[PDB]
Amino acid sequence: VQPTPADHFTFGLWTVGWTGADPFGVATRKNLDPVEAVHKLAELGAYGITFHDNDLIPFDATEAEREKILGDFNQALKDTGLKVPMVTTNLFSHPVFKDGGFTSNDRSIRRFALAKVLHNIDLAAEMGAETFVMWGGREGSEYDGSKDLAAALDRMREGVDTAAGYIKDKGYNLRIALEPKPNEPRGDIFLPTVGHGLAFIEQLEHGDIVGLNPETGHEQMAGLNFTHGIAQALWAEKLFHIDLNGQRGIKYDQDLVFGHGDLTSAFFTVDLLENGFPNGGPKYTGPRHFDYKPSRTDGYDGVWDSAKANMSMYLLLKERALAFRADPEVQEAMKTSGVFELGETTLNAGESAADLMNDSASFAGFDAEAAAERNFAFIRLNQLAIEHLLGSR
Amino acid sequence: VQPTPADHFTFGLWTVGWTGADPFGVATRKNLDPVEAVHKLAELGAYGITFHDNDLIPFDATEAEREKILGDFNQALKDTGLKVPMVTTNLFSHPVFKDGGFTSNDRSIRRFALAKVLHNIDLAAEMGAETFVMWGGREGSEYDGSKDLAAALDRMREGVDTAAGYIKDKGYNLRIALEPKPNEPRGDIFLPTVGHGLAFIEQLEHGDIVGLNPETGHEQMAGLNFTHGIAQALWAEKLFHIDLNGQRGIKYDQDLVFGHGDLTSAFFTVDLLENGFPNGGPKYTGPRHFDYKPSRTDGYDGVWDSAKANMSMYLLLKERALAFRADPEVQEAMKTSGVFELGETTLNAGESAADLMNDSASFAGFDAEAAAERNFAFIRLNQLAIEHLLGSR
Amino acid sequence: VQPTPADHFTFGLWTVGWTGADPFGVATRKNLDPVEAVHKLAELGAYGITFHDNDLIPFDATEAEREKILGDFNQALKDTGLKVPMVTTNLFSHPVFKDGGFTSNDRSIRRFALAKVLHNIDLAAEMGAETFVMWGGREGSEYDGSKDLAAALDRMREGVDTAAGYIKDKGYNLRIALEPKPNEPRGDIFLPTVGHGLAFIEQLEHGDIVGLNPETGHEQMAGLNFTHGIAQALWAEKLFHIDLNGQRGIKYDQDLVFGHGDLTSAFFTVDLLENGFPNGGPKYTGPRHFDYKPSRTDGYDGVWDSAKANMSMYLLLKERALAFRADPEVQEAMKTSGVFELGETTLNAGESAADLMNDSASFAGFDAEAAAERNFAFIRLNQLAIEHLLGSR
Amino acid sequence: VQPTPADHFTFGLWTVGWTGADPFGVATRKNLDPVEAVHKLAELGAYGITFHDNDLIPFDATEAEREKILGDFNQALKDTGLKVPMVTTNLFSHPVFKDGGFTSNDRSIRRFALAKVLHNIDLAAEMGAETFVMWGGREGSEYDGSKDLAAALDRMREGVDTAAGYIKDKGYNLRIALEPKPNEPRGDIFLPTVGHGLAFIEQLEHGDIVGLNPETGHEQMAGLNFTHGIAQALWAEKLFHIDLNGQRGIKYDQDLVFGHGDLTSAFFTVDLLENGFPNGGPKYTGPRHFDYKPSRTDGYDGVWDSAKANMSMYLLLKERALAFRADPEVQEAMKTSGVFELGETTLNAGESAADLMNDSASFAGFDAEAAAERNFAFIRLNQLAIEHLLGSR
Ligand SMILES: OC[C@@H](O)[C@H](O)[C@@H](O)CO
Ligand SMILES: OC[C@@H](O)[C@H](O)[C@@H](O)CO
Ligand SMILES: OC[C@@H](O)[C@H](O)[C@@H](O)CO
Ligand SMILES: OC[C@@H](O)[C@H](O)[C@@H](O)CO
């Protein structure tokens, strides 16, 4: 399996650039020059690179430094051919963002945070990004009385709608993608799961350009089924981007290589990205972005190995998932279990509520105990899927 | 603390009627006559009673039996004065519902399930209920390939929209309330959290009459903040009902008495139900419904004790939550922490995106390190809240 | 991969005999006759069968019924050659055990539970079982004040030492194995994980014959690593038996087929059971016992499919794990990462604490900054295992 | 409730000295000088202070610097009278310990880690500490194939027995206390819960002087009951020290103030530390050590508030717990529920297993159906505890 730019594997600069500092220890790796990252990633088969404004341009950078850095970075882009599909803002590392950007209790700070996002939309626009991500990491609380929960959601809408309004105003071909996370760094984060982000979008003035950027590990941190979560995002036509990684349970976000967490879940995420829905439906057509961190135990060969591991993992799962649905045994098993039958509407063409209550065959004369005898054979369909995952079929 | 009908404590018949059978053991209590439950609950201060169609009327009941039971039950209602604010359908106990009602793979079963709900809307209407609850307990899967996830959501919409359409058609003064649950009985349940239920409502043809019925324990089973979840439901004006109980962690749904789980969370749920939001906003005005199960270890004195425990727990939390916000120290502490400041809009009246990026005080000349010095004092606000919870203030 | 008696695959009578009643519904399958169970299991390639006293003999059975059941049951064993390697007692389904068997607050229930176990040891010995499992499913509480926690453990010790002493006194060739479970059906069970189980055994008078019976799903309910957990039992020489199944997450116990839960974990469990430790050490030679339940959505064809699936899953993982370890590229990745270097003692033969203290090279002149550059290459080593698991190397 | 030295409240230097760097941002507070820390703590009513060798003496410090630091530090102790009851080692922050101290795959890191601990025992003894804590924070893995699991435990044993033997050899008056942690910073830590810690100690050569140092937040990260967990350590005579804090859920460790997590659990922890067991047994007489971190959102006023808050929380719970147990209504609720009857031996003085077996009244003529009607009244008993906790009885 060799990734080619046609695969669309994108990586953030913070992923391979993550230095190894965590709650209990200092960095184990030297900083990564952004030019170097770009060249390395392009030699592995990456299609593009993403960044946070401060991944690239330091918080205190003078104008001269910003031009230099950008000059250096765009040169690397021109040399390698890498695209920049997504840009995001860091509204979490500086101490001023300790209570949030957009939902900070301090108003002067809320205003700076929205100003910092607006400037970053310009930059995103200049880099040719199609997506602008919002990961509200400091938006939330440790204690329940710290916030007025209705005012926090108004404050979040004000920021997102101002951003969206500004895109429309400038004529930028950019969409906003919110990235849910249930906790960490805060005790509780606002809009914690794919359903909470989708719900919020519907309350926005400019929600037509706002969608989601679900991350595997984030949903699994609430113990939810990531595949089910991206299926709801897809079904509402709001899956604008994805952050792929692995997580091994309900605990801190591990950010492991994609497929290095819940493998069977990973397998069915790739089937959904590649195969779409069994009865037809929208398909995810964007970048397959990896948002992970190379373990701090490993030196720089480990970093390039882990970059590679991501794309290898995606490609192997993809091979198996295509083999899985192409198998006649699997198709027959899907039929038997009623996967295709789920696709047929419950009512008949022009059959109303009254029409059906009335129909004696569907209710009064319906034989509930006979119907209950159906062997759905979901275990056998599950064994078939795993056997294809293990490469034994 | 003595509950009076003015408190609006409602209980389902399945709660005190729960007999004690679980995964590993048989019932420890005799069945509860519904007439008796009604009389008992009315003597404790209950305001109303709720039920599932089969809690009352057996699945195989002949018409004569249904009239008898209903005659017996409405007589008890007339004698005690209890109201019936909510009615719900059992789409989970019979073996025919093993794969779901509305999202069953078998179409004949999907049709029976919708027929069973439609008939139950009539009954709900006849009992004078204001709310009709939908808890999709068997809608989901154990294995990821069992369902076409986009067709499961279409199938769920077909059922809910047909139900809603039928209410509108009959002129019934009833609203539908969906009740999210992340797992149990299925491995994964569709619409698993408050955000997922709210997201789905926005895709419905008749979503103006569809809202939520969040349950405490259900949200805590995903490890989410229940108070934050009902604040988002309130903020979207979709908190139509509530199921109160307690849960002690991420594990099976325990269904303990309300306040017998996460006490501090319970405390802040009551503050939100009673006090509303600190800066103003919608208020929950419905029944305070308890959906719990008396421990199987206890005999029938324990059952009435636990019914009582629920209302006692609510009333004690309520007393403390009113004392909490009335305290001048607490009001000052809320000010200092910026609880009130969160309520002020981020932008100035008629200030646009361009206007703010431009303003040098908000960005370019904003002093980020000085701003970061603010002591938000959230710990001290948290200690103040707990001290009022413990009755030491 | 076709299993054969030589594989030592054993199944409980309650696994395939599980009829589908969960907490939200009734049985979806007809009762399985135990003689049919023996015939079907033997035909599939099983080596043995295990049971709970009330899995075979009803609670209410008379001595005539008991003798009748055992004679047919023993004839079936004969006809097929299945052994009965483990026997266990039901100390959880009847309403008398609602507060527990050995740790019930009621003393008369405690003597009844212990007498029920004492008679059951006699049946275990008669059947030729080598292991007597003890799963204390109702030993625990929902509320912290329900029990005197020191007393609960004194009473647990008393039951186990009385039973252990009875084995010793009659010279039966049997060992006791405790099976930890963190929760369900109690909110908290005593001896919740493998560590608590092992710790508890060291306080026993007759600890020499008491060991553990870990269950995959049970340690995963606390989010613990099952391979780490069994490694510690193995290391202590206390892994006497095992219960294999699957669990997707921290939630109720699912009891899926082994392999249908956390697959990467299942792969390494199989590497530890089959291959042991990289540097040598203890090995688990017992039966490979499946403690799972066929999903309630499926008819009896799915029950036999599921039994089959457990054995296939085990043999497919076994194969990948043998090929994984045999791979020269893997053995070289292991040597880079220091897997074999962990096997070396830290101290030199004859070195003492003082010796090492005052060895300048190990401390005072140690280059800590040079030692930290070591690329452990744990990521690469993990990718090699998944590629072997995926049937790609 | 004002704390006083007699309360035996100790705080680590790293708790109040924690500056705010988390995984998504930098320090939000200035470094706290250790002499200031002693002065501030003593003034608040603390009895003692604990520290990690690098909390006081930098990793790079020269012998001149080390002696300079200790002389000022020892003068402050003198001036104030604070004791130093526990000393611990940092075997987790420097990049050399990225794979662990005692269980690092690299042998040279293993001798360095053990030498660092050996020198630290000498400092502990000089300071007059009675306890030497060992938190093995980097002993573990992210991937299952990274370690030989039996070797990891042999190496852990080797370090602890070498250190234990050194204490014994120099006649220091010190005990070792292991502090279990399930995850973070490793995906899986060896000896993840109290049970694994206790089990491991029984395999030690010098186990007599090795015990535990449980931490509230740490057992709650596996969803375990902290009161059950410490009860087992207490019952084993292995609770040598404790780390108190709060955690809201299975997620990263929050280290909130004690009481700001699971409050009902905190109440019963305090009842076990203060009051012991209802029927009598062992008691924990050590210091009440707070292992927490002041939230990064707050300035130094919140740091002193938080230190204060830990002590108040403990004294408020203590009070409620003394009044709870002293209550005649509670003592009568306890007697109904069988709390005192669990204290009776199941077997009669001199009864043997055979005796009970053949006692018709305890088995053969036992009315199991009559015994099951017993109302244990666990719900009512729980309501009495919450009402005492709520300051209402
Ligand atoms: O949990 C961290 C999130 O994964 C973010 O890194 C977003 O991907 C970008 O801000
Ligand atoms: O988890 C079970 C749910 O709580 C349901 O009982 C609804 O409340 C009613 O169907
Ligand atoms: O959770 C249930 C346990 O797995 C038990 O079935 C034991 O294996 C046998 O009693
Ligand atoms: O998770 C961190 C632990 O609580 C440690 O701080 C120990 O208490 C001391 O090393």
Ligand SMILES: [Al+3]
């Ligand atoms: Al991301």
Ligand SMILES: [Al+3]
């Ligand atoms: Al409910």
Ligand SMILES: [Al+3]
């Ligand atoms: Al088992």
Ligand SMILES: [Al+3]
């Ligand atoms: Al600690």
Ligand SMILES: [Mg+2]
């Ligand atoms: Mg992340």
Ligand SMILES: [Mg+2]
């Ligand atoms: Mg429920």
Ligand SMILES: [Mg+2]
């Ligand atoms: Mg089990």
Ligand SMILES: [Mg+2]
């Ligand atoms: Mg900690």
